[PDB]
Structures are given as C-alpha cells and as structure tokens.
Amino acid sequence: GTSNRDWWPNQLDLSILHRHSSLSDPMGKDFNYAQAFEKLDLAAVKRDLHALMTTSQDWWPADFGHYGGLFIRMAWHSAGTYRTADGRGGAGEGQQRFAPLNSWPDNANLDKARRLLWPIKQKYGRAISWADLLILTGNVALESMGFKTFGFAGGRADTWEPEDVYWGSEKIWLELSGGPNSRYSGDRQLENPLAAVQMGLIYVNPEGPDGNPDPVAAARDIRDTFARMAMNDEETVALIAGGHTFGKTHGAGPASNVGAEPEAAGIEAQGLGWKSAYRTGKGADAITTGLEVTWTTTPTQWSHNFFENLFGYEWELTKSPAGAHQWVAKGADAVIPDAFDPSKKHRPTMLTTDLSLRFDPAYEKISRRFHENPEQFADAFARAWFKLTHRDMGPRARYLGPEVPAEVLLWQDPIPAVDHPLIDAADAAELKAKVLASGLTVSQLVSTAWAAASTFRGSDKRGGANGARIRLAPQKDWEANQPEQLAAVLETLEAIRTAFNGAQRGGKQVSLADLIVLAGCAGVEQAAKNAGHAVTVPFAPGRADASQEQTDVESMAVLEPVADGFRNYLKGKYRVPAEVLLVDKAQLLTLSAPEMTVLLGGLRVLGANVGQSRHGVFTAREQALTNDFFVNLLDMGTEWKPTAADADVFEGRDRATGELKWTGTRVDLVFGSHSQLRALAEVYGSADAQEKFVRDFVAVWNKVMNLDRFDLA
Amino acid sequence: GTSNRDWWPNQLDLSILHRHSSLSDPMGKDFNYAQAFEKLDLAAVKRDLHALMTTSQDWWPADFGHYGGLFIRMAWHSAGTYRTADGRGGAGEGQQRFAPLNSWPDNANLDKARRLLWPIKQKYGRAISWADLLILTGNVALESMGFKTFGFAGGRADTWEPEDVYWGSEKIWLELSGGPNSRYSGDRQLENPLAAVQMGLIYVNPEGPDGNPDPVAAARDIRDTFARMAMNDEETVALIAGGHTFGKTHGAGPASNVGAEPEAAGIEAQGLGWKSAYRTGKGADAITTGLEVTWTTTPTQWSHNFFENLFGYEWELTKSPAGAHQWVAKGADAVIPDAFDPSKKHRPTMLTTDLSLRFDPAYEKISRRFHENPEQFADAFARAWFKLTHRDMGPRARYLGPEVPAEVLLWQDPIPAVDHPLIDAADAAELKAKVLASGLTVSQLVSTAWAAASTFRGSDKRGGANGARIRLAPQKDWEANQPEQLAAVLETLEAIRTAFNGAQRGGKQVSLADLIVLAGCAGVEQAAKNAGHAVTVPFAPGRADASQEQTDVESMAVLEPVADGFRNYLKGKYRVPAEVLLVDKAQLLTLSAPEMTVLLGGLRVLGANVGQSRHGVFTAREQALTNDFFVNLLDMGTEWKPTAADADVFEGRDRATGELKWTGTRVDLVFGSHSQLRALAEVYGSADAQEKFVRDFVAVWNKVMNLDRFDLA
C-alpha cells in the first residue's frame, strides 16, 4: 500500500508530536505510576529476582547456572542507547521491548532475558514498570553476585509504542563506515546526535573500528561514544571492567546458523528471535555476537580478576568459532571455567575493546590505579552504574522508593531545597507591578522567561527554569540567549528581588528563578492588555536558585539551542531543514502540533525573536498579544519568494503592487505551506478566534514555564 | 532517518488505530461541531458564496467570469473518492485539503478553488467546517447558475490529519494497468476495495481505458467504477451529463509546463501547486488535465445543451494543445463561447467518456430519455447530486440545518421514528432476567448482539444494530451470522418481546433492535457473574425496527463481514494476512489497539467464535468473563507450531510434555507476537488485572453497541 511518506519522503512528519496519546495507552487517563510504585513491596520483588537468578529454564539455560551476567548486560543495553545530544534513548521508557531496539543485533538474546522476567512482571502488575524492572534486575544480579550497589530509584513509567528517534540513515544493519549514508566524515567525526559507531550497536564494535582489531584505535571510538553518553574516562573504564568482571560472550558456531530477529520472525516465535540451527541452539551452543570470551576465573562472582588478567598476560590475536577477532592470553593455563561442562577449562580471553583499557595511554593509568586499589575500582563502578542507569530520569524529585541514594551528585543538575515561606498571590501581584514599573519591556520579559524555560527536554527531563541557571555559565553566554540584553534584564530583576526580599518578615523570600518566570507572566499580561484583553497568567512559585558549583558547565553545553524556531534562531547552516528542527524542538518540549502553532505565532508578535529580527513578525502592533501572525500569514493578497542573497529567507509582496509587506524564514512559512500545519493556522487566523488564541497561548506558555516542576507533580 | 517501516515493511501498522487524538485537534475537548453549526447563519454564508462566484481573482481568473464550473468539480472530487467496499473516501471529512488527495493529479488546480474560499471560511470560523463548505459551495454554484438542488445537510466535522486509506500499490502516479503493482487482474477486474482505474484518478481516464480513446470500452470502466461508488446507470448518466453542463476543461499548452503538485512544491508556494510556465500560467493559458473541451453554448447556465450537442453532431478524434485525445463536432459552427475573449468562438467538443453516454447501448437509452425530457434529467441529477455529496454522512439524525430534504431515501438505510415511551431501567432489568430465564446461553446472546452491532463502519457511518436488520435479508443469511442458530435466537427473543409488549400500558413498548442489544448486555452480565463478578452493563434504549421494504438488499452486501477476527472468521483465503484484516476491522469500528485487544480476548472466552471453533478459546471456563485468553496466551510453558494441514492454524503444546493444550489462528497469536500488541496483552494478563479487564471489556462492549446511536449524540 503506497503511503504519503512514499510519495513525499522529505515532507515534515507531525505524528511524532502526537505519540503517546491516551488512545494507545491501556492504562486509564488518571493512572499515576508513581502512586502504584509507592505501594509496591519492593523487598518482595527483589527476593523473587534473587530466586530467578539461579532458576534455569530449558529453553535458554543459564550459563554457569546463574543468569546474572545476562541480566547485567540486559540492563546496561537498556541504559546504553542514551545520547547526551538530545537526551533521547536510555532506560527511562523501557523502549528495549519495542521496535527497533528489541531487534537490534547488539540486543540479540536479550529477548530471552526479558521473557525470563515475565512471571515477575505478571505477578506484580502495574506496580512495577518494565522500565523499572529491567534496571532493578540488573541491580539484583550485581547484588546476587557480591557487588553492593550505590542505590536504585523507581519511577520510570512504561510507554506503549516506539519512541521517534533518529538512529541513523543507513539502510543496512551494522553497515561499516564510508557508505552512502555514512555516519562518519572527515577524521572519524561521528554525526550529532548519534552515539554509536554502526547502526544497531550500543556503543562500539567489539572487534575494533569497522572490524579492524586495533585496541588503540578502538579506544578512540570508546572514548567518543561514551562521552556522547555523558561518561568520562574514569567512569568508562570502571563500567567496562566492572561489567566484564561477570559472565561471558556467545559465539559457539558460525553466525549463519542464527535466524530472524524478533520483528522479522514468524508469528509462532511469540515475540522471540535469533533462533539458531547450531547444535541445540542455546546454552553451551549459544550464539549471540559470535565472540567467544569469558573474562574471569569466577564469572558469577565479583572479583578483581579482570585487571589481574588484563595486566598479567600478553595477548595474541585469534578467532572465535564463528570467525570473529578476539584475544587469548599467551602461554596461559586453562584457568577459566566452562559455562556448562565441569571437566573443561579455558585460557583467559579478551575483546579488542577490553585491551583498549590497557593500550590507550590515558585509560592505562586509570586501569592501573584500579588494579592497585581495588576499593577505588569498586566505588567508581558502583557510582558509574548508578549514573548509567539513572542519567535520563530527571531531577531527584522524580526518584521513588526506599533505596534512593541520599548523596546529591553533580550530574543530576541538583536544585537546592526550599527552606522558607513562598510568595503568595498578593506578593506575586506586587512583584509583577514592580517588574512593569521598572521599564522592562514586553519583549525583554517574554524573551528572558522563554530563554530560561525552553531548555527543558522531555527525553531526559533535563533543563527548564528551575535553578535560575540562565544566570550562570554557560547559559548566560549563549548566543541564543542574547548575553548583553540578558545581563541588563537580570540586573534589573535582581534589584527588584533584593528590594522585595529585604522588606520581608518571617524568612519569606523570592528566588531569582521564580522571579524570572513571574516577570515573563507579567509581560504576557501586559501584552494582552496592549491588545485590549484582560488576562491573568497562572504562576506557581517554588523554584530555587542553583549555584555555579552545582552546575557542570560541560554537561550543560548540550542543552545549548543551536536551532530554536520559537525565537527564529539558527546558530549556523545545517543539512537538516529548519522546519524539521522546529518539530524536533517541539517534541523535546512535549508540545502537540496545535501547541507548537499557537506558541510560535504568539512569540513572534511579542518580540521574542533573537536580535529583534523582523522575520515572521507579521503584525503592526508588536508587543500586543494578538493572532495577527496567522491572519497575515494566510492573506492571499501576499505572494512569497525566496531572496537572491538567501534561499532560506522569503519576501512577501503585495500581489497587485509588488510592494514588500514582510519577510520570513522557513520556520515562519512552513505554517502556510505544510497542509496539516496550515489547517491549524486557519483555526487561529479565523475571525472568531482572537479569544481562543489568547487563552490557548496562555495555556501553552504556562505549560512551558512548568515543564520541570516535578516538585509539584 | 531509517524507521521501523523501512526495517520491517510487512509488520502490522497499529498507528492507524491511534489517529484523530485529542493531541492533534486544535479545538477544545468540549468542542461540539453540531452546536456551532446550528447557530451558523447559513443564508448569509450562501449570499457570500453567491457573490464570490462572479468576483474574479487575478491570481486565478474565473473562466467566463464565473467560478461555478470550478466549484462544482471541486465538490464532485471531494465526494468522488468514496468506495462502497469499505466506505472510505468521500466528502464527509474534508480530506481533499490533506495529503494525498490535495495533490492527486485529478485534483489539479482544486488547490486554487479551496484558496478562493479562505475569506469565507475565515469569516465564519468554526461554525462551518471545510468539509461542509466544500459541498455547500458546489450547491451554491449550481443554484447561482439556475439549477434547483434537492437540498443540503451540514454536520461534516473537520478532521486534522490524513485518513489512512489503501488507494492502491502503484509507486508511480497514474500508472497504466498491467505493471508490477497492477490494480487489475483477469478480464479487467479491479481489485477490491479500489474504485478508480489508475492511481490518483477519481474514477476513470477521460481519454479512455489506459489512454485508449474508445467510448465503448470507456463505458465499461465508467459503469464499474461508478457502481463501486454506489451509483447505478441512471444516476451515472445524470451526474456526468449534469456536471458537464457547466464550465470547461483546461489544456492550453503542453503538460511539461506544469510544476510540482502541492505536497512537493516549494515552501514559497504556500500550499498551492501545479505552477505553470505556459504563458501567464492561468486563465486563458490554464493547464489542469491537458484536455481542452468546453461542452455547452452557455457554460455558466443550466441548460439541456449537453445532450443537444451529444446527439445533434457526429464526433471526430482530435488532440488538444497538450496532446490529449478528445473529440470535436464534425462540420459544426463556432457556437461555444471562449472563456476570456468575447470575440472568439469554438466548435463543440467532448471527452471520450462523454461519448460513452451515447455509444454504450444501456447508457444511450437513458441519455435519450433525458434528452427528450430534460425535466427528468434535472430531477435525476438533483437527486444524484444529493446522494453523491451525502452518501458517507451516515444516518439522517446527523443531518443539520434548514435545507435538509424531508424525503427519506432508500440508500440512507432509514430507521423509523419512535412514537412511544421507552423502557426504563426497571423494565430493562426485567427483560434481562426474562432473557436469561429463557435458556438462551451467554454464547448465543453475545454472538447475536455482536453480529447485529458489528456491521457498523465509521468510514461512512453505515451499519450497526439500529434497525434490527439482522432479522432481514440479507443479514439473516450471512454465513458469519450462523443463519440457523440466528433464527432460533431471534424467535425466542421475539416471543419475549411480544409477551412484554402485550403486558404494557401507556403505549410503552420495546423494539426488537433494542432487545437484541439488551439481550447481549444480559449475556455479558451473566458471564461476569459466572466469573464471580457483579456488574451492570450500560444500555440505552431508543432503537427502532426497519422493514424489509426499507432495506436495499444489494447495497447491504458490502456490509457483509468476510473477515471478522473478533469471531475468528475468514469467509475465504485472501492475499492479505488475517491480522491485517483484524486491524482494518478495528479501524472501521473506531477502536484503539487497547480496545481491540480487550474486546478480542473477552469475545474468545464468551463463545463468540463462528461455528463454535475452539481456536483462541484459551480457557477452561468458557462463558465466564475472565482474562484467561491473555494469561494462557502469554504462558511460556506453552510452545506454538503451525500445523501440517494448515500454516494459518497453530498448535500450542506443553513445552515439557508435548501435550496439546490449545489451537489458534494468526488472529489469536498476533497478540503474543507483535511487540506493541503483546505489551497490551501483558497488562490484561497480569495478576492485578481481573477488575480492569472486566471494566474495560464492558466499556468497549457498550461503545460497540452504541456506534450508530447518533439520535443520542
């Protein structure tokens, strides 16, 4: 059946804004996962998980009699799709159970692992999500095998359909670099927002870059991909060596024995895949990646054997039974146990990427420190495992249950506790009047609050206006934020704040974070008044101000908007059309198509454009909250053409006279071009819609101002 | 970006069940179109439309100074996508303004027609939908040119994204028959559910079949395609000759002058397309189809000149300026006016498909009668035009406004008025107890009510339990409905009804339509009771019984279910996998994926299968309402394999012993195979889900029972 995507493959896809509707969700519309989880008997779940570890099923027998290694890998793949670039991927939505990730080649046989958890999921029902279960099982596996974890938070709500993520443009699974859709260019530069080296891999190729077994070049890829998942050198060595303290790989025979991945298998396979014709197809005959490596002399117990073996032997290049490159210890005795046959033992083996930990010079120093000080290694790995499994969860207010660590970590972008009475409605009125009396304009007030709040992304729940981090490095210097104008607005706001706070009793005070947001609300109210409408914009206090020492400047850099269509901003020229970038940003902000439409039309007229650009400012009453953007955009009395100087700027001219009426970008004009967007614009550009526009604008404005308000959730 | 559809192109698509969410809709959740329309000043809209007809815009100058012809074609293409096989397409959702229909080659330049209506749409806002406006404008065009229409009903609510319709499998616009994706097989047999001869055409090719200009052969395609839009010979002749009484075609120069259709055009074109480099690109130089035919001597006035010309001249095969085949009157004078130059005149011209009306022998008799009796032609055309434009609107209860015709037409599947007091809640409880005391089983009661209510399709709002047409030809003889079992149930229910109705005072009585549904409600309540649960199933009386004389048997044939996954039924063996047919049925019933899942699992254990098949009946307590279907389907202790006899039937065996536990079809087992469906099955198969399962089953049962209840809307 031919589809619109077939006929017009480069037209914008708005269905990504309408996912995760109440239609696809089986739970009622008021189902609150947090409340279900809070009543879960978590200790009972953990006892069941401990039992499962050694309860081998005949359809996928447990290596060494213990599924721990398989479940740790399962949990690390669950978390390991995360990209700091957009916040997308990670464990936080349980997306491993859906396409495509359920069938990625790197997730081979993790279908079996998830199926082993069905009876526990079934027993506890809606009170523990799959997303939470996958991570808890990884924690229990570690604990079962003698490693004490740093803690665990629940609260990852399950999702019910595939997340829309750009994973790459290759049309062949695992395609090597330099093809027609290469994710690499130049000096091995991986394209943003990707965080893996080949389509269908978590991070890197275990044989080495594009299959070439050089540990030093492999180290480069490990470092690049791990940095793109938010992990530095210490955390990376701790994670890889910690993980490979346990379990084994599977490559007992040739890969051509292995059949269709789950999404391609027959209906009789009942959701499972990679069925293998090699001998029994499982256990001692398992084939998962094709590598055949067992790292330690006690694969089911925490030990310090990974680094003893790494440093204690010299390594020779060899091949697994499936033909994959891997390394064997020169001259070693057969000291590694077999996973099924008590009378067999094996020499120590390593992956190319394991040897990176020794042969990359920066990794070697950390590996050596961990080898000499195994207590440091233990603590680093525990902390890293917590980070890995919680990095996409959001602020600490979302963390549920009795195992949440009390230590506050820099990567969590922590927000101080509020310790004082908050402002009330009479105080908010007084502060709004002070803000309007100072001379700050509608444009300044709206632009600053937008700049503060629109850093939020729902993908990893980072960003937003809580914290007042717009006043700190690096946000205060971002070009999209207009540093000189920002400084002057913040200075005026801080004077108002200081005066209000100095006048209070009883410890009451207002944060700068709250005041920025409140000042934006005063500007929207003033804009409505300018248009002859009486509007009150809702405001919820309770934001606190974070310090510079609580704000990791390099981790903050991914939140920098390089494209923000809501302010008609593009930092440079990109291969992706700007309207595709707008929809991407709308998705991160959790906006539907109607919300994105209303919001953008209103911001244009309020003067939220960066640099005071006139592009899309289709009104003769700037700083008044009207639907002018829509009524003018849709006026057939105007004809639009790309400019000579710039194909991405358009001039709109009177059809009868040729006189210039307006200019716009692709972000402005897409609302008059895309047939679903123009349908939405027509609603707001109708003669009966001025009041609807104002009230829908105030709603969406308020929504954006509260995106990060998990303390009120 | 590579997507799941790319990787797994034959996996089932559930997103078709989750369109039309509250996320995509710009109107509030409480917006009621009918309430907005009922306050529209319809007479004022029609006066504005009447003015528009002769107010030419210079960006698309009006032929003959009158847009009438253009708007009639606009309104005919809006309705002309309709297929009786599934009820999909038609005018009832305004889908012409979305992809793909906005850019079909047959809809070329209707973009300009819609843009001409923006100022009126803008003036009246949400009180008149695009969908209604399209049709109204074609009525006003006709009226302005002297034709008295049969009437008009408003009430077509606007939609906000493209409908998912199978329009064919060709990958090239207008591909000629016999390609790799041919819609034709055998002796020119058009595949169901298609109703057009080439991808991107409304009905037929105006040159002739695959471009061959033979009016006799073209007649065959006209007859076949019109029949597939539910029009007979009389109606077809009336429509084509009536339409071609007005206006002209456009082919002033070569088609290679014409640029990209709207979905492919640049952003600057602002939703318009087919921009032409031929001379001025418009007006006298317009190119739309490439044909250049003007049918009558007064193209802006109703007349009987189409048939005077058709029968008064002999016709010669010729070519337009773009090279298309067309016909010119042999030896004629220049009597047809030019569309822009008052000093120029032209000979009569015709399409191949016009001459079909004279050269097909059955058409010729009707055309002759209409020629000799133009009052009959006018009446036929008026009636047909109403039918064409209202055929997908549904029951007469949905018809709004002051111009609704009072005559009740057989194609409307009319339902008589209710003239008596309805049963109350106490009466409903007494009838449910009498039904259960009769000895009718849960299975019989559920199966009968399902068979009555599940003929509904939301595509054209035909079918449903209102009317009690299950007791009439042809529904009573459909194989899916189990004619002998149905007859015995209906006999028992009619005895109950007769006894109840004979006992009442005050004229109160119960229809058989209401009692079939209520009997099904009693069956579901009893099934819940069998499982240890007391529930009330909601029931809304007010259905009435239609007669056989009010039921067009041939028109009812398309409602026959030949695939009903909810009863595990397939009338024969099809190209399309059964699971795809299930999702198609779910879509027609307006069900979400969660609704379809609950509903199916419940029907299986209630005994709803045709023929008492045990396939998918995964319970040891049939006729009790439990979640057994899901608990047993998801049990990994069972292994499933296709049977030797039949690849589409599967045996479920104990994994350890080999014992045969169950059998199922593809429809049953897809719920354990598809990753999004199995996630839903898991919810209902959880240990905490029994109450949720029953609640959700009763809600969807009730939803189905009320699909056609537009009298309560």
Ligand code: HEM
């Ligand atoms: C450079 C990064 C890494 C590479 C290339 C990589 C590669 C692999 C490969 C190829 C397998 C074998 C899969 C099979 O054939 O069954 C595997 C297994 C595993 N990895 Fe990693 N690994 C990486 C990092 C991680 C990290 C961060 C963790 C966890 C903290 C982890 C924990 C595991 C465990 C536990 C197994 C054993 C699975 C079993 O016993 O069934 N690895 N790794």
Ligand code: HEM
């Ligand atoms: C076999 C069925 C039909 C065929 C093949 C057909 C074909 C066409 C073609 C090729 C055009 C010229 C489009 C252009 O170049 O501008 C057209 C114009 C038109 N058709 Fe049809 N037609 C059919 C049925 C109908 C029906 C059922 C109606 C309405 C009752 C309709 C009303 C019109 C009108 C009013 C125009 C003139 C548009 C204008 O003035 O701009 N036709 N027809």
Ligand code: NA
């Ligand atoms: Na994420």
Ligand code: NA
């Ligand atoms: Na329809």
